[PDB]
Ligand binder design. Structure first.
Ligand SMILES: [Ca+2]
Ligand SMILES: [Ca+2]
Ligand SMILES: [Ca+2]
Ligand SMILES: [Ca+2]
Ligand SMILES: [Ca+2]
Ligand SMILES: [Ca+2]
Ligand SMILES: [Ca+2]
Ligand SMILES: [Ca+2]
Ligand SMILES: [Ca+2]
Ligand SMILES: [Ca+2]
Ligand SMILES: [Ca+2]
Ligand SMILES: [Ca+2]
Lengths: 223, 223
């Protein structure tokens, strides 16, 4: 998160850290056994770390559950990052408590101007490379489809939204990938891509979770 | 209290006024020797005033007992106001009558929608400024964790819940800090913080007392 603030300890209980020795991607807990992330965050063997605030220090609220089944969307294109959504199943159900909780799936898609929470342990810098220990938060609005199409001409598909600022300064960055964009209590976006971080007329593009509620709901029942 | 009503005389017998030359914070009597307040209501010199209705006129039911022990929760953060709870021991035991009584600790956590009574000598305006002589009361519901987080993104932890109105108009304000949120006979909340007072989609944030019952019982027994 570039231009955001340090989240309060466990204020984002649905946020998980995808681990493979170190932190590489983010995700969101939607039930006791299922984490939803990004398809470009796929790798064979992921440890899902829940209840984190400081990813480099053990605090007492962490549940470390390895992935048992990593499912990528079948219609995922990695030329356009279309359908950039991934389902990860845990070994065991995670113990849902006051600081490890689930986020609701969208009952409807979110209008432009609606406010959302983007979170991650990703890069706080826009230039070289710099990673924070504590989770970072970004309050950003959903931009109209028109602004998104004009910011990335011929690039923003059906299954994409832009969330943030045309002025720049505030955006998600490298490492925030797969992370939650939660609007009005519902997971409306997954951190996908953008042109750099916090650039002018270059807001972050996010996966439309509302297009995949049936696919997720079916896949969860399936497996 | 903004948008509340003037409390009946001694209708809130567990309500106390923290004094340090003048009213600044509130508290709740949980036994004859212990007042529970907020950690951000800390001061090295507190006189605990019990049995008050008009804090500016001596009425005859008042017990003025200086604080002997002000104990702040050890894991208290005053950047995020997490663990915003404080225990105050009196010099002398308070004389428990019909106008000075104890409030019960929560036997269980409170559901969303349950109604509660918030009380205080804090500011009655959401606009300018007005501080009352007489205690003020507010009937307000417990909001869902989702609504609280949606109102304060990256700010509401485990140990915080929201009590009030997304519509606005009714809320606690500056000067109500440390005061009781009592639901169905039990102390479920302590007046902590919020973004202004009585603003739209900005309800008051309160310390979740049900998370600290063991800490209170132990701290009181220890000391
Ligand atoms: Ca940690
Ligand atoms: Ca292609
Ligand atoms: Ca840091
Ligand atoms: Ca008042
Ligand atoms: Ca009165
Ligand atoms: Ca007791
Ligand atoms: Ca008086
Ligand atoms: Ca003593
Ligand atoms: Ca402390
Ligand atoms: Ca004394
Ligand atoms: Ca009690
Ligand atoms: Ca609610």
């Amino acid at each position: 998160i570039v231009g955001g603030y340090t989240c309060g300890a466990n204020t984002v209980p649905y946020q998980v850290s995808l681990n493979s020795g170190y932190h590489f991607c983010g995700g969101s807990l939607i039930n006791s056994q299922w984490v939803v992330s990004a398809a470009h965050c796929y790798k064979s063997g992921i440890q899902v770390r829940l209840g984190e605030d400081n990813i480099n220090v053990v605090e007492g609220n962490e549940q470390f559950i390895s992935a048992s089944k990593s499912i990528v969307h079948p219609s995922y294109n990695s030329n356009t990052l279309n359908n950039d959504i991934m389902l990860i199943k845990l070994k065991s159900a995670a113990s849902l408590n006051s600081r490890v909780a689930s986020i609701s799936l969208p009952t409807s898609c979110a209008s432009a101007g609606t406010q959302c929470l983007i979170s991650g342990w990703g890069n706080t810098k826009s230039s070289g490379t710099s990673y924070p220990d504590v989770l970072k938060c970004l309050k950003a609005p959903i931009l109209s489809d028109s602004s998104c199409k004009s910011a990335y001409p011929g690039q923003i598909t059906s299954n994409m939204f832009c969330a943030g600022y045309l002025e720049g300064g505030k955006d998600s960055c490298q490492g925030d990938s797969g992370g939650p964009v939660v609007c009005s209590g519902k997971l409306q976006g997954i951190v996908s891509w953008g042109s750099g971080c916090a650039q002018k007329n270059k807001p972050g593009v996010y996966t439309k979770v509302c297009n995949y509620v049936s696919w997720i709901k079916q896949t969860i029942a399936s497996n």
